[model samples]
Target: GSSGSSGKLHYKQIVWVKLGNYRWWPAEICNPRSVPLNIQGLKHDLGDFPVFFFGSHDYYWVHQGRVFPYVEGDKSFAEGQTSINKTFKKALEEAAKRFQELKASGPSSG
Candidate 1:
């Protein structure tokens, strides 16, 4: 989803850094341990140009971006984190279910 005349896809650049003990987790999540040190967020489209929406409670995004996680180990903080993760997970599950249903129904039927 590129807006330019060339129709090349463009992604918004985001810089990420880790603080304290959490810094150790990124290497594990990213594997390799030396993958450009840049983290990519969920990509979306805005009027044809690709854009990424980093959810507010994404601890990875907050920690890596040096933006401070929602709160430090509190009930509200935990709830926020759970909510964000669940929302994204549900979206994916729903999409998968829809795809399966479509396949079963066939293109001409739906």
Candidate 2:
């Protein structure tokens, strides 16, 4: 998460949502049918924690303890969860607002 010595913000988490045909993996469907997951509103939490979700080669990672889902794949796809419907864009905006609020408040005294 150290940005690979670049002195920049690096992602601490990777939330991959595998697409394509697989027994365990499923593709995501966005609301409005126009927004891609990357730009969707469901990505707000990503700013606080590094998150990545997309089609990947190894789908078994989902079972890993370190990997947590902001939105579960099956539920998101089948139920059309609001988070999935909004995707990352909405989430990112919320994250930015939260970040700004935290910055304004300054570090916690504790």
Candidate 3:
């Protein structure tokens, strides 16, 4: 099935983020603002778009088409399924540490 997005996803909204491995993982939109494709040269949204942050403290400009709204009772979210994505889950722990660092370095003038 082809996933489609309406481009209305907002920051802090929990959703399922798809990866290159053809798996969808739980994630939250960290940065809703548009990202710049180029700064030195002229920038454009042609390929640039909002980025979704992973619990692993990583983010990616995943194609909106691959993003999906989080729903409860989904089979993929079953506890037993977590083992299949253990590495992905472990990465989230690393991301969480970075997430704190990210927040620590934000909005405050040193």
Candidate 4:
């Protein structure tokens, strides 16, 4: 599905695919008007190119979601933490199911 390491380094960029037979539509999470490149567009654009993403291993584009795993047992905070790991685990698990659901449903729009 992809090549290179999974999961970004917080502020790093994910240049997974080589730009060839198509356009690149980048977006920002903070900008509501900036629409992201939909999966359909990517599929259509990459018809002849091989399908491999730069950081596709740890992320899920089907549901417009990505796994952002955090550090566990960080004693730097006074409260220690409030089950972020547990919540993320369940979210990640559920995403897998949602991915299958979306897959069966067909191509994505966002």
Candidate 5:
């Protein structure tokens, strides 16, 4: 069955973004609005890009399948930390920075 696109995430929503295979860290959806850039990386076009912030002044991207709603009583990620040691850190950061820069630049006047 084609589910098509996964569920949608909104801005400023608290979500648990998967990091390692067994870790889902706390993250906030910073920007829910869509961007007009085709990010150059693996799984860049995986899911909705809501700009997930790790509360470390750093942001990253994750597939909708890798993101889940953060419930107060979720003991699964109880031992999870808001940090990741992946190569995609820099790539994701760049992607976030690009989004920020684009936002700062404002909408096009064409």
Candidate 6:
């Protein structure tokens, strides 16, 4: 099992975001003792862009600072699963594998 920190298990548990159905990628694993996810950083790192969720807050306009759910014709997605260490699912295959690397690497999980 993993230790108690934003370590292996932490990164493995991080959210995987799919922006505009383009591709599935790993979201940052926020430090548990620090604050919630640096969504602001994601705003710049990912995009000063809009985010669509499959659940509540289903859509967020991530521009410096913005909020609300929107619907025109497309969808935004974030995915999560329990598997770690090895590879399995072809759907989120790359994302999961990257998580494994970042997990074993450090608390930075970069």
Which candidate number maximizes lDDT? 5
Q: Give the per-residue lDDT digits (tens) of candidate 6, residues 1-110.
A: 35654322231233444455444333333332333354323434432443423222233333322222222233344235455532223424443454455456756524
Task: Show the lowest summed lDDT stretch of 10 residues, model 3.
Answer: 35-44
Residues 1-110, candidate 5: write the lDDT tens digits. Answer: 14575557755556566667764446656653432233323245646565544534455566565666665443443436747656445544443454455446756542
RMSD of each: 15.9, 15.7, 8.8, 14.6, 9.8, 13.7
TM-score of each: 0.22, 0.23, 0.46, 0.22, 0.44, 0.25
Question: What do the candidate models score in CA lDDT, each in turn?
Answer: 0.29, 0.34, 0.51, 0.29, 0.52, 0.36
Candidate 4's displacement at residue 82, Å, is 18
Rank the models by TM-score, top first. 3, 5, 6, 2, 1, 4
Clashing pairs in 4: 16-54
Each candidate structure's count of clashing pairs: 1, 17, 3, 1, 0, 0
Estimate the overall C-alpha local distance difference test score of candidate 3: 0.51
Clashes of 6: 0
Which tens-of-lDDT digit does each residue in 1-110 have in candidate 3? 13665456655455666666655566655553442343224333544335545544555655454566654434444346344556566645444454455556657432
Cα shift from native, residue 102, model 6 (Å): 0.3
Candidate that beats the other on TM-score, 4 or 6, i.e. the better one: 6
State which candidate, 3 or 6, has the greater TM-score: 3
Query: Best-fitting candidate, measured by TM-score?
Result: 3
Q: 92, model 3: CA deviation in Å?
A: 7.5
RMSD of 4: 14.6
Candidate 4 residue lDDT tens string, 1-110: 25665633222222222234442212111111222444324442211222212212222232123322222233243133456454334443443443344346755442
Q: Residue 10 CA error for candidate 1 (Å)?
A: 22
Candidate 3: residue 64 Cα off by (Å): 2.0
Off by over 4 Å in 2: 1-85
